[PDB]
Design a binder for this molecule. Structure first.
Ligand SMILES: Nc1ncnc2c1ncn2[C@@H]1O[C@H](COP(=O)(O)OP(=O)(O)O)[C@@H](O)[C@H]1O
Ligand SMILES: [Mg+2]
Ligand code: NI
Length: 259
């Protein structure tokens, strides 16, 4: 039964329409908020059957930080709450596809993504990430499949064996902001090459990374600007990588003067 005072924080205020995903830790549904008709993704997690006191604190503290985020290029966290012995996370529905599939399209058509199109999407992604960093929140899982795109071409940085392993993460050092920058650079490269720069185990990956053993992007399709931005973002040394604000400023310049 409906509970109007409860907003997005109770299952009674949602109607489940379809199971749309199965995760390793969760099951994901499409649903509608009965109060305003807004469609949403609803995750249900058995955190009591998989987590411990400490983990639940970390996860829940993190989710609560995430709900404060508010930006057009970042998946919105409307609510989270314990109910039926489960963590329920209510998220902005991002239903139309993602960067991983866009890249498959181009591969299938045997075409590269024009530089202009790369910037069109990358600049939105930078916008998303600068918002997060400005709020002192690290994303932690930047990868093409986690970069949703609406039917209208809007980037939606999705909800936080990882796809892009940074050197500090490979060696179990702390993830931090420069680690997001590393992923961001790998993603820019992947948009331009249609493959990860380091496309195979962690030792050989470490080797490759320390020696920049990745194939160069073709200079006849991609500007020095695009290629240098990749180069500096995936520098093995975190201190050599630029902050997100510098990356964003280039993306905006390049988006402006290629469109
Ligand atoms: N906000 C969302 N909107 C639509 N689908 C989503 C959303 N978040 C996740 N999904 C889908 O749910 C599936 C599994 O969720 P996932 O993020 O892997 O959860 P976990 O990693 O905790 O198991 C994925 O295929 C993904 O496409
Ligand atoms: Mg999963
Ligand atoms: Ni190593």
């Amino acid at each position: 039964a409906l509970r109007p005072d409860m907003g997005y924080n109770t299952l009674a205020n949602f109607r489940i329409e379809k199971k749309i995903g199965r995760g390793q830790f969760s099951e994901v549904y499409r649903a509608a908020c009965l109060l305003d008709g807004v469609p949403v993704a609803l995750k249900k997690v058995q955190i009591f059957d998989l987590m411990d006191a400490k983990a639940r604190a970390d996860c829940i503290k993190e989710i609560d930080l995430l709900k404060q985020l508010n930006h057009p290029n970042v998946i919105k966290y409307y609510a989270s709450f314990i109910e039926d012995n489960e963590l329920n996370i209510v998220l902005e529905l991002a239903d139309a596809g993602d960067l991983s599939r866009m890249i498959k399209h181009f591969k299938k058509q045997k075409r590269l993504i024009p530089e202009r199109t790369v910037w069109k999407y990358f600049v939105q992604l930078c916008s998303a990430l600068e918002h997060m960093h400005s709020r002192r929140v690290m994303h932690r899982d930047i990868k093409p499949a986690n970069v949703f795109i609406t039917a209208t071409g809007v980037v939606k940085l999705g909800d936080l064996t990882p796809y892009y392993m940074s050197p500090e993460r490979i060696h179990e050092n702390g993830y931090n902001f420069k680690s997001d920058i590393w992923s961001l650079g790998c993603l820019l490269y992947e948009m331009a090459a249609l493959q990860s720069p380091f496309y195979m185990n962690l030792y050989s990956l470490c080797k490759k990374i320390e020696q920049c053993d990745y194939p160069p992007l073709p200079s006849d399709h991609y500007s020095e600007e695009l290629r240098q931005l990749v180069n500096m973002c995936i520098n093995p040394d975190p201190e050599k990588r630029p902050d997100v604000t510098y990356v964003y400023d280039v993306a905006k310049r390049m988006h402006a003067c290629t469109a």
